[PDB]
């Protein structure tokens, strides 16, 4: 069944675990940074699991551009 929150398994290779996580980005303290993928009905993924550099993540958060996770980015939005 499937799960909401910061401790989900965001993708097939998700490295974020509530039992092992530590801060990575300078904006993180006790929670993993996340970003919304606009594919389909949309879903949330951990920014770190997408291999997003900090500045790419911050610029995305400072704009209205939609983001598409690594899994769905190559899908024809046609």
């Amino acid at each position: 069944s499937p799960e909401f929150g910061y401790w989900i398994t965001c993708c097939p290779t998700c490295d974020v675990d509530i039992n092992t996580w530590v801060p990575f980005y300078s904006t993180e303290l006790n929670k993993p940074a996340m970003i919304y993928c606009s594919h389909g009905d949309g879903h949330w993924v951990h920014a770190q699991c997408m291999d997003l550099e900090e500045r790419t993540l911050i610029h995305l958060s400072e704009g209205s551009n939609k983001y598409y996770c690594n899994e769905h980015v190559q899908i024809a939005r046609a």
């Binding site: 300078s26 904006t27 970003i35 993540l57 911050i58």
Partner: peptide, 8 residues
């Protein structure tokens, strides 16, 4: 894009 924990 909408995000979480990206606030300086």
């Amino acid at each position: 894009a909408r995000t979480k924990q990206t606030a300086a």
